[PDB]
């Protein structure tokens, strides 16, 4: 009877202007990817194609790039109201920049409606933030009533910085009453949406009651039923299947990350409200699509700050940043000593007062540093210096691993020694010992990590049976260069920020910085 | 173009049902959403609910829920209010109006005549 | 919500400059259209998105805007500018009139 079609994107992580394959950085425009433009191309033929239509989105539009550091969610803003977005959800990296960062730039100023149906304010943020963020809503759809539910993880509080005056409950129990509440309302159509994860998605098509479709994300899953059109390996087929407990089939859908692909997925209703139909795969905004002249003009008008604010000052240096390759492939080096302290400043959340931080630790390799940063040109850093010695566009991801997976990395790190191999770790809030004497797998003697469950910080010993939680960017966690062991027993994975964000505010905090080989690594 | 007459005169003393009607010419009736308010005197408007011709698929206010149904007719396009167990306060004007907006710049345009009751 | 109006009795003589004022519960973002309602007839809509212009309406009709607070300006008053002006919502669902000024 009754047809529609859905545009679904989901983290973005601020992939604003073109990109390539990887989706770092493109510089051969013939072979190049995404952007917004072009998605206002495609959402515009598909508009006039087709009568009933619903462009939706799925959260974490914030955190990546250089557009999040200079203006801080007006940019999404801006173009989300100019490709008319028809409603949003709440992410994990909304709340970086604080609950005052989010009210003001995007809760305000935003022309569509957001969603979250488990977040709740108590003390005086009750009157402030009441109003901005909705549980539900109703939307006229062709010549229908289409009712919409969101929700968000549970985990934000140890992801990002709310606030202690918001509170996260659990998905399904805030859920269903505003589903039976919307049925009682004479709505039969019904559509979540929300940033969780793949899983408890799954897990809502079946524990909750009256769920005709989900939409999520999250989690950076690829679903495509057919021939792949590029390198990604997808994990299972499009409109995803489960058997509800109320005897019915729920689809569940997303479109990987970045702007690489757009969701397309068509669905037949009948009278009652329940879904017969679904097929659909996602699109791949390769160059055969183009751009629109109308947002490209206003995105060059808008990157002129960009280029004027990468030649600027953020701090000062009286030391020589040894970030060569000599030196921080083979012993320690003060620039990954930097690196860390800026890693963990960015990790400080909330005193649960039976701990001061629940995660007190870094790793880093030394084939993720590139270029040094000499002090005589009137002890002055720049992005650029930054960007130089990251140049990947990588961010730095938190896990949990046992006492067991770690000496397993602490041990292949330095199982051969003297190549220049880029495999050697740099750390933070840990002390190591070596002994290159010993068969490779047992050249690891000592090793001590820092009390979190613990009034006054100490250095204590490691127990091969506990759960540490842990920093490592992104390229490790992956797998990279050798680190099958990390992939392969870790219990669970955060995404986190930009690199260069980090340093970048770890250095224009201190103002001067004169960092110094300590003693975190040496050979016996 | 033109939202026409709805209807004359009806007193209804309390207790009766009512059965109001707009028609419309001009322009395809079945493309946009018909609403249906209500000023009594002494007091500001009352929005009631939607109506879309095609289907219906109407939506109301959460205030008149058993008190009021909306049909549609179309063939000759009219659209079709039903008060039951009036009440005796709730005298005042019924209108019509239609839905007309593109992306986020909607109003009510075409406002239909009164029907005092 | 609820929509409230500043001016319940506002007269002014034509030649001057008037102003009405509509005040929100909670916070409609800019989805505000002032109405027009000459007595014994179907109202007429003036200002859509609380700053466009309706096609038709002289340049003297003005609007503003952006948050809870919401402002309608008239200058250059004429002998047709004498009627009820409304302000409603259209944000969430359930669409909130006000009382109405008149002048």
């Known amino acids: 009877a009754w047809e529609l079609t859905i545009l679904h994107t989901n983290d973005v992580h601020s992939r604003l202007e073109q990109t390539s394959e990887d989706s770092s950085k493109c510089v051969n425009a013939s072979r190049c990817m995404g952007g917004v433009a072009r998605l206002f191309t495609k959402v515009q033929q598909i508009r006039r194609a087709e009568p009933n239509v619903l462009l939706l989105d799925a959260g974490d539009q914030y955190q990546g790039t250089i557009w999040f550091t200079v203006y801080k969610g007006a940019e999404v803003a801006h173009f989300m109201n100019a490709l008319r977005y028809d409603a949003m959800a709440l992410g994990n990296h909304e709340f970086d920049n604080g609950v005052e960062g989010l009210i003001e730039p995007l809760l305000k100023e935003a022309k569509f409606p957001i969603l979250s149906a488990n977040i709740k304010a108590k003390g005086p943020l009750a009157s402030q933030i009441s109003g901005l963020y909705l549980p539900y809503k109703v939307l006229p759809v062709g010549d229908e009533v289409v009712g919409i539910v969101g929700y968000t993880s549970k985990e934000t509080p140890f992801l990002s910085n709310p606030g202690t005056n918001l509170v996260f409950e659990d998905e399904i129990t805030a859920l269903q009453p505003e589903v039976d509440k919307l049925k009682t309302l004479n709505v039969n159509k019904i559509i979540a949406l929300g940033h969780s994860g793949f899983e408890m998605d799954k897990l809502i098509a079946q524990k909750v009651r009256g769920v005709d479709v989900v939409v999520g994300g999250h989690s950076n899953t690829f679903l495509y039923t057919g021939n792949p059109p590029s390198k990604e390996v997808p994990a299972g087929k499009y409109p995803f299947i489960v058997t509800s407990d109320d005897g019915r089939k729920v689809p569940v859908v997303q479109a990987y990350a970045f702007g690489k692909y757009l969701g397309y997925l068509k669905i037949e209703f009948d009278e009652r409200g329940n879904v017969i139909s679904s097929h659909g795969n996602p699109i791949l905004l390769n160059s055969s699509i183009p751009e629109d002249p109308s947002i490209k003009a206003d995105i060059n008008k808008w990157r002129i700050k960009l280029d004027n604010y990468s030649t600027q000052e953020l701090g000062k240096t009286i030391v020589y940043l040894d970030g060569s390759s000599q030196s921080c492939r083979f012993r320690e080096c003060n620039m990954g000593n930097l690196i860390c302290d800026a890693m963990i400043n960015n990790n400080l959340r909330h005193t649960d007062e039976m701990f001061w931080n629940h995660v007190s630790m870094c790793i880093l390799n030394g084939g993720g540093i590139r270029s040094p940063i000499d002090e005589r040109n009137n002890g002055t850093i720049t992005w650029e210096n930054l960007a130089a010695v990251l140049p990947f566009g990588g961010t730095f991801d938190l896990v949990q691993l046992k006492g067991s997976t770690l000496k397993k990395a602490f041990e292949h790190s330095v199982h051969r020694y003297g190549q220049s191999t880029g495999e050697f770790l740099q750390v933070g809030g840990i002390h190591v010992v070596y002994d290159l004497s010993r068969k490779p797998g047992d050249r690891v003697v000592k090793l001590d990590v820092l009390c979190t469950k613990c009034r006054v910080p100490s250095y204590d010993p490691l127990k091969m049976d506990e759960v540490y939680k842990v920093i490592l960017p992104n390229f490790l966690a992956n797998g990279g260069d050798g680190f099958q062991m990390i992939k392969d027993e870790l219990l669970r994975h955060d995404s986190g920020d930009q690199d260069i964000n980090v340093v970048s505010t770890y250095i224009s905090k201190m103002k001067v910085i004169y960092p110094a080989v300590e003693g975190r690594i040496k050979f016996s | 173009q033109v939202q026409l007459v709805q209807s004359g005169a009806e007193v209804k003393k309390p207790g009766a049902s009512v059965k109001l009607s707009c028609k419309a010419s001009?322009?395809?009736?079945?493309?946009?959403?018909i609403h249906w308010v209500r000023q009594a005197p002494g007091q500001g408007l009352e929005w009631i609910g939607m109506?879309?011709?095609?289907?219906?698929?109407?939506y109301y206010n959460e205030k008149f829920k058993g008190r009021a149904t909306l049909t549609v007719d179309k063939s000759t396009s009219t659209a079709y209010m039903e008060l039951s167990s009036l009440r005796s306060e709730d005298t005042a004007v019924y209108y019509c109006?239609?839905?007309?907006?593109?992306?986020?710049?909607?109003?009510?345009?075409?406002w239909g005549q009164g029907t005092t009751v | 919500i609820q929509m409230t109006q500043s001016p319940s009795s506002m007269s002014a003589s034509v030649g001057d400059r008037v102003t009405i004022t509509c005040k929100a519960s909670?916070?409609?973002?800019?989805?505000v259209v002032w109405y027009q309602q000459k007595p014994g007839k179907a109202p007429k809509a003036l200002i859509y998105?609380?700053?466009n212009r309706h096609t038709g309406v002289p340049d003297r009709f003005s609007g503003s805007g952006s948050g809870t607070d919401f402002t309608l300006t008239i200058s250059s008053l004429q002998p047709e500018d004498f009627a009820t002006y409304f302000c409603?919502?259209?944000?969430?669902?359930?669409?909130?009139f006000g009382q109405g000024t008149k002048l």
């Open positions: 109006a239609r839905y007309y907006g593109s992306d986020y710049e909607w109003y009510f345009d075409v």
């Open positions: 001009g322009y395809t009736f079945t493309s946009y959403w």
């Open positions: 109506i879309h011709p095609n289907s219906g698929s109407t």
């Open positions: 909670q916070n409609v973002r800019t989805a």
């Open positions: 998105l609380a700053s």
């Open positions: 409603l919502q259209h944000w969430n669902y359930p669409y909130t």
